[PDB]
Design a protein around this ligand. Sequence first.
Ligand SMILES: C=CC1=C(C)/C(=C\c2[nH]c(/C=C3N=C(/C=C4\NC(=O)C(C)=C4C=C)C(C)=C\3CCC(=O)O)c(CCC(=O)O)c2C)NC1=O
Ligand SMILES: C=CC1=C(C)/C(=C\c2[nH]c(/C=C3N=C(/C=C4\NC(=O)C(C)=C4C=C)C(C)=C\3CCC(=O)O)c(CCC(=O)O)c2C)NC1=O
Lengths: 480, 481
Amino acid sequence: ENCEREPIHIPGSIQPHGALLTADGHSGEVLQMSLNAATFLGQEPTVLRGQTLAALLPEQWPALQAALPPGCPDALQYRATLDWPAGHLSLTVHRVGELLILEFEPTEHALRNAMFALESAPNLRALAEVATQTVRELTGFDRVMLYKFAPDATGEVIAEARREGLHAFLGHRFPASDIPAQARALYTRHLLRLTADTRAAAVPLDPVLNPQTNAPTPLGGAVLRATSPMHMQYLRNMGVGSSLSVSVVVGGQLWGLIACHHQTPYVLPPDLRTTLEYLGRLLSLQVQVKEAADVAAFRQSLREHHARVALAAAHSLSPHDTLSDPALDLLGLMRAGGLILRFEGRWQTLGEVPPAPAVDALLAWLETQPGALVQTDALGQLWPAGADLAPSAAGLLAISVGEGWSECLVWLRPELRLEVAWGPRHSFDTYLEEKRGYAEPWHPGEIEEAQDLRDTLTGALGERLSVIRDLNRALTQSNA
Amino acid sequence: ENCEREPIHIPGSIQPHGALLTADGHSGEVLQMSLNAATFLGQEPTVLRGQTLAALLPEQWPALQAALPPGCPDALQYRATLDWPAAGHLSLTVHRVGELLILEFEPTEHALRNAMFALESAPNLRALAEVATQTVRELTGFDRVMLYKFAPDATGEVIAEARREGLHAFLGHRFPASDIPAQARALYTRHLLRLTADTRAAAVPLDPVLNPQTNAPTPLGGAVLRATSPMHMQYLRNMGVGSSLSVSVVVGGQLWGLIACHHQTPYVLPPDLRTTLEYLGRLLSLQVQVKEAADVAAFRQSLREHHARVALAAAHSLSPHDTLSDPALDLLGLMRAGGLILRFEGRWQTLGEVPPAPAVDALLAWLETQPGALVQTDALGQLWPAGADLAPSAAGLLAISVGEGWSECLVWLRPELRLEVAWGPRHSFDTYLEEKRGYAEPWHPGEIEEAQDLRDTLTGALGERLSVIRDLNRALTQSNA
Ligand SMILES: C=CC1=C(C)/C(=C\c2[nH]c(/C=C3N=C(/C=C4\NC(=O)C(C)=C4C=C)C(C)=C\3CCC(=O)O)c(CCC(=O)O)c2C)NC1=O
Ligand SMILES: C=CC1=C(C)/C(=C\c2[nH]c(/C=C3N=C(/C=C4\NC(=O)C(C)=C4C=C)C(C)=C\3CCC(=O)O)c(CCC(=O)O)c2C)NC1=O
C-alpha cells in the first residue's frame, strides 16, 4: 500500500561482493566504511578510520581530484585500475556534495562488429532482436529481454534471447504498479544496475550517518547499492539469481529497459560491464533512427492518397462541399468506419455513424477535452457514458481546426473485442481487469498525416476570413 | 573550374603503406591486386593470381562469408587479425561491393571510459567541443586537432582547437563552399573515417585496373587505402602538412561537422587506435543533439516571462492592431530589434525606428515574392540587392506570415553593424572576404523558436475571429428580414 513511498535512495547498506568508502572531498579523511571492508582490503579498521586518502592511495589522489572538481554533477564517474598485495582491484569514484564515493570490486572485436550490425538493422523489430542476441553472446546470460514503455506507463516485452528449455516471455505486458515513480526517476539518471545475488544479506556502513550533514548517505550513483527487500522477494518466487538492467533514455524520457536474468548466482567482471554501458549509448541512439524510418515508410505509401486531400483542403472555400466528396475518401486514408464533419454549425456524417442524440453527446465531450488532438482506441475507458456506442465508435481520432472545438473532424473505427491471456502472474491479472472493449490501434504514420491536414486547413481559415469581410464591405457600399 | 566533376570514387590506385585485393564474392578467385602486394605478402604474383581465398586464408573464409551475406549494404565492415610468417601479424579489413569482396591489409602491432563521462557532463557546446579536441590530442598525439561546424549555407567554422605550443591559432577561421565539393560531401556522409599518411608519396596502381566482372573501374569509397586527390595533396603541400585524419559528424542524416587532425611529419597510426576514434565519432554525434537542445531551452527560459505576456494577449486577439502595438507588451525588446512592422487588414503600422514609407511598400512587396513561411537574414543587402541602401534601419530581418500569402505579417528590423573578418588557405580566405560587406546582429535560435510560437497562437485566433464576423452578418440579415 505504502510501497511507493519507500526511500530506495538511502538503503544504509551495500551488496556483499566488494568494498565501499565515502570520505570528505577536501581533506580525504575516511568517514564511512562498510563492516566487510576490514577483511576485504586486508587492513585493520582502526588504521583505516582517521586516515587520509593521500596515505592510502598515494598515486591516484592527484588524478582523482583533477578529474573531479567541486561543482560537477553526480553523474560523472572516474575509473582506475590499481594493484594491491591483499590482487589488483577495480577503483570507481564519484562526487556527491563534498563527499567522494569510492567503489571497490575484484577484477581479472565483438563490440566493433556489433556496432555495424546495429547501424544496419532494417526496422525496430530487427534492431531489438539483434541487440538482445549480442548481449547474450558477450555476457552469457540465460534470459535477455527488452521492455518498451508505452505512454500510459506499461511495459511491453517486444524481444527475447533465451536459453533452450524455458518458456518464452514474448508478448508479456505488466502494469504501472510494479515499477513505482521514485524508481523511474533514479533509472533516468543512472543507466546501469546490478544485483549479483537475491538471497544475500546486506552489509551496513559504519557509521550509517554522514557526519558532514548528520544525514543518510545518498548512494543512487553507486553500483553496490543494496536492492529493495520487495523486488528481491519478487525474483525469489520465480527463482532468479542475477539481475542486470540497462536503461534506455530517449530525449530525457525512459524509453525502455533491458533486463538480463539468471538462474544461478552470478558476478560479472567490470571489464564487460563497460561494453554493456557502451551498448546502452548505442541503443538509445539507433532507436531514434529506426522509429523515424518506421513512420516515414508508412506515410510514403499513403502519400498519393494524402496529397489529393491536402491540395483540396488548401483552397477550401467550402469546408462541407470539398471534404465530403467520395473522390477524396477520408475513410480509407485513416482506415476508419465512421467520419463526422462539423463546420459552421451543421454536423454532417459520412459512413457508419452512431444515432443523432449520441452524436450531440460525443461533440459535447470533445469540447470539454483541453487537448488539440484526442487519440483513443477505447472510448469506453475515457468516456464512461459513451461505452454502449462502441459498435460504431470504439476508436476515436479527433482534430480541432482552429481552437475551441467549433470546427472539428472525428474519425470512428469499428468495435473489436480484446481479451488478455497468459510472481508475474498476479501482476498479469491486474492488466487483465483493465481491458474489456477496444478497436484497431492507431498507427503513428496516420497521426503525422492527420496533423498535417490541421496545418493546411487552419492556413485556409485565414484566406476565408479576407473575402467574408469583403462581402460585408461591398454590402455597405450598396447600402450607401 | 571543373574540379567539382572529378571522380574521387575511382582513383585506380592505392596509398603505399599496405596491400589491397579484390576478389569475386562467390568463387573467391583473385582478380585485382596492387603491384606492391607481391613484395608485401611475400609470395610470387603468379601464385596469387588465379587462387581461391579458401587456399590463401583457409580459416577466415567461413567467418568472412557468414558476417557478409550478398544483399547487405557496402557500409558494413568486418575486421580480423591474423598471423603471417612474412611480415608478422597483419590487420585484415573486408567489405562487399556488388559481388566483389574487398580485402584491405595493414601492418599492426581506461582513457575512453573516462572521456565518455566527461562528454556526458559538458555544460554547453563550447565546452563539449573543447574537451573532445583535448581528448583526441591525448590519445593520438597529433600536433593540431580542430573541429569544423558546417553552417546551413555550406561554410565551415573553426570553433575549437587543441594545438602544440609554438604555432598560431586557427580559431575563428572560416572557409567557403568551394574547398569541399558536393561529391566529397556525399562520400563523407556514408564513410565516417578518412586517412592520409603521406602527402608526397606516389600512388600504387592495381593490376588489372578494370574489374573483369563488369569491365568497369572499381569503386573504392569504403576503402581506407584510397588514394587522395592530386589537388587536395598539393593544397596540404603548400602549407607543409604530412598526416591528415578526418572523422565526420553526421546528425539526422546531415553532415554536421568534421574533426581534422593534421601533422607536420609523415605519420602512420596503428589500426587499434583508429577504432577508438571511430567510437568517439559515434559519441560526439550523439551528445551534440543534447547540448544544442540545452542551448535554446535555457535561453528561452529567461525571456519566457516576457514571452508569456505577448502570447496570452495574441491568444484572444480580436484586434491585431490594438493589442500588438501596446508598449506594455513591447515586441522590440523580446527579439532585440530596432524596428517593427505591423501589417494587418490592409493598413501598415510602424513601431520604433523604421525606413521611409516608399521603401516600406517595396519591402512588403519583396516578402510576398518569397515562398518561405519565415524569412531569416542578418544581411538584407545579400538577399535583396535593391534594398541595400536601407541598411541603417533595416539590416537584419525576421519576418513571419500569419496564415499564408503574406497578407498579414510581422517584420522585425535590427540596426546596421559592420563586421570584418581578418587573418594555401589564404586565397580561400579572400573569397570569404568578398562576400561580406554590411551585416547586423545574428539571430539567436532561441528567438526563432519563440517567433514561430507566436505564429501558432495568432493563426489559432485567425479561426476564432472568423466565427463572430459571420455571426454579425447572420444577425444583420435576421434584422433585415
Ligand atoms: C518477469 C518478471 C517481472 C519483473 C522483474 C517485474 C517488475 C519489475 N520491477 C522493477 C523494479 C522495481 N520494482 C520495485 C519493487 C517492487 N517489485 C514489485 O513487483 C512490487 C509490488 C514492488 C513494490 C513496490 C522497485 C523498488 C524497483 C526498482 C529497484 C531498483 O531501484 O533497482 C523492474 C525494473 C528493473 C529490473 O528489470 O529489475 C521490473 C521489470 N514484473 C514482471 O513481470
Ligand atoms: C587549412 C586547411 C584547409 C583545408 C584542407 C580546406 C578545405 C578542405 N577540403 C576538404 C576536402 C577535399 N578537398 C578536395 C580537393 C580540393 N582541395 C581544395 O582546396 C581544392 C581547390 C580542391 C578541389 C576541388 C577534395 C576532393 C576533398 C575530399 C577528399 C576526400 O574525399 O577525402 C576538407 C575535408 C577533409 C580534410 O580536412 O582532409 C577540408 C577541410 N580549407 C582549409 O582552410
